[PDB]
Amino acid sequence: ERPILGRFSSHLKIGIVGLPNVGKSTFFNIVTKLSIPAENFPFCTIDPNEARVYVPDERFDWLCQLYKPKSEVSAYLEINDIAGLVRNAFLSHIRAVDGIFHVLRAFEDSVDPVRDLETIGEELRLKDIEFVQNKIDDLEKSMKRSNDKQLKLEHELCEKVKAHLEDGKDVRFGDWKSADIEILNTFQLLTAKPVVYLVNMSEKDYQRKKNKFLPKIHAWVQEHGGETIIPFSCAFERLLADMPPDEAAKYCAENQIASVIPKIIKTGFAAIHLIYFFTAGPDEVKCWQIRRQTKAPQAAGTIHTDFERGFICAEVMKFDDLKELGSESAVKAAGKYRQEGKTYVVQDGDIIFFKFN
Ligand SMILES: Nc1nc2c(ncn2[C@@H]2O[C@H](COP(=O)(O)OP(=O)(O)NP(=O)(O)O)[C@@H](O)[C@H]2O)c(=O)[nH]1
Ligand SMILES: [Mg+2]
């Protein structure tokens, strides 16, 4: 696997992006009404357009109804509400996020989501060209007075990126080398950011799993990267959120309909190349956010630096093996507990105990 095109951090954000009045803030408000209170993040300053929501996980809940810890800690997704494009402070708001929830209109009050996919598409490609051109101009000036091998390599990349963007293609869909990605991460280009398509439609359409605009959207996406498309009804989700659990479950069974907000949160979290491992014990069961392609020692460090500095090994059992057999004791008895070294890339769902010092 090649290195991942993304910002070097685990404090990642996802931004709600789309044309005016497509249901962005309604979606955000449904998110907020289901968000973790701001005071739970004392190290942070959470703006009114920001929200942090828990990531649901069926493995995590199984690890609770088998351990009953003192504290249960889920992972979270940070979502940022950006206003609609009317043309920016819009482009500087996208610069602050790492992935995109691309919200599309597919409901009747010209309704053309494919056009909107091109409209946002162009606006993002063009803004990237402005960034890349400004770099080429800056690199060329420096090369007149310097002979650093890096200045040529960066210029060479920029020019390849410039031609890629001008051909209508997005940065994240180019075939880049390792050293190419490392420099691209230094730019954090707009069309490098992964997207999830959230197609907003009427409750009726969403319920009967049929929409007139979807086959076209689907055909376009397949021709432009093949990223995930989630159909959803903003109105319906709004209506369900304002209900108490009692009525909400009754409304769902009676209308044969179900919320997709969980899947949205789960897909957003995965989209921005975040995964988590578990530490399961009788005192704590916690999902530990890490970036995909993190090695075992670095994963140890996020819990406590001693774990990384003194790293001996990571004792990892797979969830399925714990599920099939009895418990931790039963798993060790069968000898499933793999002892993985410094070179081991942590896989999502790994239940880990670290050995150090
Ligand atoms: N029929 C219908 N109307 C919607 C839907 N979502 C949004 N709207 C309309 O759009 C208006 C604004 O709602 P909002 O969720 O803020 O949309 P927005 O995309 O955040 N607008 P902005 O681009 O200014 O941030 C609402 O008053 C409503 O009339 C929808 O799913 N169905
Ligand atoms: Mg809004």
UniProtKB/Swiss-Prot annotation:
Q: Does the keyword Coiled coil apply?
A: no
Q: Give a GO cellular-component term.
A: cytosol
Query: Which co-factor is required?
Result: Mg(2+)
Keywords (alphabetical) are: ATP-binding, Cell membrane, Cytoplasm, GTP-binding, Hydrolase, Magnesium, Membrane, Metal-binding, Nucleotide-binding
| Ranges in a coiled coil | none
Keyword Metal-binding tagged: yes
Chain ranges of the TGS domain: 273-356
Q: Where does Mg(2+) bind?
A: 25, 45
GO molecular function list: ATP binding; ATP hydrolysis activity; GTP binding; GTPase activity; metal ion binding; ribosomal large subunit binding
Enzyme Commission number(s) from the entry? 3.6.5.-
Residue numbers binding GTP: 21-26, 107, 200, 233-235
**Broad EC category:** hydrolase
Gene3D superfamilies per the UniProt record, alphabetical: 3.10.20.30, P-loop containing nucleotide triphosphate hydrolases, TGS-like domain
Q: How is its activity regulated?
A: Activated by GAP1.
> Where does this one sit in the cell?
Cell membrane; Cytoplasm; Cytoplasm, Cytosol
**Binding-site residues, ATP:** 21-26, 43-47, 81-84, 200-201, 233-235
Instruction: Say which domain of life the source belongs to.
Output: Eukaryota
Q: Where is the OBG-type G domain?
A: 12-252
InterPro entries reported in the protein's UniProt record: ATPase_YchF/OLA1 (IPR004396), Beta-grasp_dom_sf (IPR012675), G_OBG (IPR031167), GTP-bd (IPR006073), P-loop_NTPase (IPR027417), TGS (IPR004095), TGS-like (IPR012676), TGS-like_dom_sf (IPR023192)
HAMAP family hit by this protein:
YchF_OLA1_ATPase
Quaternary structure, per UniProt, is: Monomer (Potential). Interacts with GAP1.
Q: What family does the Swiss-Prot or TrEMBL record give for this protein?
A: Belongs to the TRAFAC class OBG-HflX-like GTPase superfamily. OBG GTPase family. YchF/OLA1 subfamily.
Q: What is the name attached to this protein's record? A: Obg-like ATPase 1
